[PDB]
Structure formats: C-alpha cells, structure tokens
Amino acid sequence: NLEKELLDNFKKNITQYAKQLEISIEKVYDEKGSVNAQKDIQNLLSEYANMQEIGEIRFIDKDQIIIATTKQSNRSLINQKANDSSVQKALSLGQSNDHLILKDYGGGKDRVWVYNIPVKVDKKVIGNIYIESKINDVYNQLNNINQ
Amino acid sequence: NLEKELLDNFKKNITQYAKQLEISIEKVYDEKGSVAQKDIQNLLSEYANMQEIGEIRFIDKDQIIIATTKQSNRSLINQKANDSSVQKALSLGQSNDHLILKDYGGGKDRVWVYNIPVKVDKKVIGNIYIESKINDVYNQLNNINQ
C-alpha cells in the first residue's frame, strides 16, 4: 500500500500549505480591504511557491480573471480568463477540488496534481487559489524502488 | 500548528519508505544469505535517491557499518558505528528518532535521524540508519513566516 500512502501524504501536505495561504490572503482582506489587499497577494503566492513540491500557484478572481502567478514565464496569462472548469467549480461551490493532469513543461508530458482552494472573506468567495504540484516526483521515486 | 503537521508529514514519509526498505532487505536475507550484499547496496542507493534523504547506512548486529549511500563516506565501511541510537534500536528491536545539528559544508543544519532495525525470523540482524533533510521543512516555514 506504499503507493497510496505516499500519494496521500504528498496531497495532504500541499492541502495543509494551501489552507494557510488561503487564511493569509483572507486576513489581508479583513485588515486592509479589497483594493489595498489585492497588492499583497503576489508576495504570499511567491513565498508559498518556493516549496519544492509546488510548480505554480495562480490567484484567480470571482470573474475568472488571472490576477497573479508565481511563474514569470506565464506573466502573459495575467488579466486573461482562466477558462478552467475546475476553477469555475471551486468558485461556484465554495469548495476545494482536485484532479490529475498530463502536462509537458519541456521534458515530455508529466503527471501533475491540480488543487483548487477558494478564498473566502466573510464567508463569501472572492477568488480561487490554483496550484500545480509536482506529484510526478512520488511516481518517479516509486519506480526507482520498484514499487 | 502548521508546524507540527508539516513536520509530522515529513517524518511519516520517511518512516513509510524506511519500512519498505526494511522489508526488502529482510527478504533478501531470508532467501540468500548474506553474503545478499550487492543487493543490499542497490536497495540503499535506490532509496537514497529520494530528495528528502541525505544518507542511508546499513549496520550489522555487531555495530559494524556494512554499506552507505554516500560516496564521501566510504571510509566508514567496516568501522564500528559508535552510535548510541543505533545501539538502542539493536537492543530494543524497535525504531527510534532524534534531531541533530550537522554541518555538511553550509553551516549547521537540523537533520532528522531515524533508525529501524532489520529482523529475520523475529531476531535483529542489523539496523537501517537514515539522515533526512528535515531542514527543508523549517526553511519553508521560515519563508512563509510560520
């Protein structure tokens, strides 16, 4: 059962980090209001994305506009619509969600775990944190030990 | 207590890898020997490729260091471990852990030391000693101000 255990531990880890980012962003809104908070989002995103297991974090507003990213090579996405059904689901339901994707970042299609956590202020959704996490590091290690 | 959760998560990961390595080593004893030894080195090496593991050593029941994953520590092979945590795992037949500070070249870093004994029949034949890079957790905690 080693595979399920390691994947669950990887996901649990990302989710506990992401929750604290969500709480952090919420506190900035509670303290500063929406106009001034929306400028402290980038630093939080970037601090969190330093973790080895996180590929990219985006913050997406209520209207599905990409506000910020931690990936400099994706600066062209800022102010575009996310056009992402999983993001729409989180925004509408106010619930987290997750799924696996294949994505080629330059080395061939890699397995990537996508987690969305909506950001709530006064119980209302204001946006969504979208995370691409490097779950292929788990699969790669399992293959290396023949499990 | 993000901090306790994240530390716990790291340690569970290590402990679940280390349990499978113990099982694998035990298997190779059951069904070969030693002298199993090349197969033991390959197992240690595969396991040490994970990012969060610094070094793995396999120590026999007389406390001799039999194998390491770290090239620069080959001089340790055939020496006594002279390590009280290793002695504890051998004597008690249960895992143990503790934190150390160790300077690998970049200054003293927090390192999590985990020992799991290896048993054949139900008798201790050795011990797996692991140094793990728990300072990756503390570094990230400080980076997010938690």
Numbering used by the authors:
A (entry chain A): 6 to 152
B (entry chain B): 6 to 40, 42 to 152
Sentences from the paper on this structure:
However, the highly anisotropic property of the diffraction data prevented further data processing, which was likely ascribed to the presence of imperfect crystals formed by a mixture of different forms (monomer and dimer) of erWalK6 protein. Further screening of single amino-acid mutants of erWalK6 yielded the construct erWalK6R86M (Arg86 was mutated to Met) that not only exhibited a single peak in size exclusion chromatography analysis (R86M in Supplementary Fig. 1a) but also was crystallized with the crystals diffracting to 1.7 Å resolution. The diffraction data could be processed and the structure was solved by using the seleno-methionine-labelled erWalK6R86M in phase determination. The crystal structure of erWalKR86M revealed that there are two protein molecules in the asymmetric unit that appear to form a tightly packed dimer. The biological relevance of this dimer is unknown; the erWalK686M protein does not form dimer in solution and the dimer is barely found in the wild-type protein when present in high concentrations. Each monomer adopts a canonical PAS domain fold with the presence of five central antiparallel β-strands in a topological order of 2-1-5-4-3. The ends of each monomer are two long helices, directly linking to the transmembrane helices, possibly bridging signal transduction from the extracellular receptor domain to the intracellular kinase domain. The mutation site MSE86 is located in the loop region between the second α-helix and the first β-strand with the side chain of MSE86 facing outwards. Therefore, this mutation is less likely to change the overall structure of the protein, but may contribute to the crystallization. In the ligand-free erWalK conformation, the binding pocket is filled by side chains of E91, R93, V149, Y165 and E167. The salt bridges between E91 and R93, K138 and E167, and the hydrogen bonds between Y165 and E167, Y140 and E167 stabilize the ligand-free conformation.
Among the 16 TCSs in S. aureus, WalKR (YycGF, VicKR and MicAB) is the only essential TCS involved in diverse cellular processes, including cell wall metabolism, virulence regulation, biofilm production, oxidative stress resistance and antibiotic resistance via direct or indirect regulation of autolysins, the saeRS TCS, haemolysins as well as other key virulence factors13. The sensor kinase of this TCS in S. aureus, WalK, possesses three functional domains including the intracellular kinase, the transmembrane helices as well as the extracellular receptor domain, the first two of which have been found to be conserved across the bacteria that contain this TCS. The other functional domain, the extracellular receptor domain (erWalK) is only present in the bacterial species (for example, Bacillus subtilis, S. aureus, Enterococcus faecalis and Listeria monocytogenes) in which this TCS is essential. Here we report the crystal structure of erWalK, revealing a canonical Per-Arnt-Sim (PAS) domain for signal recognition.
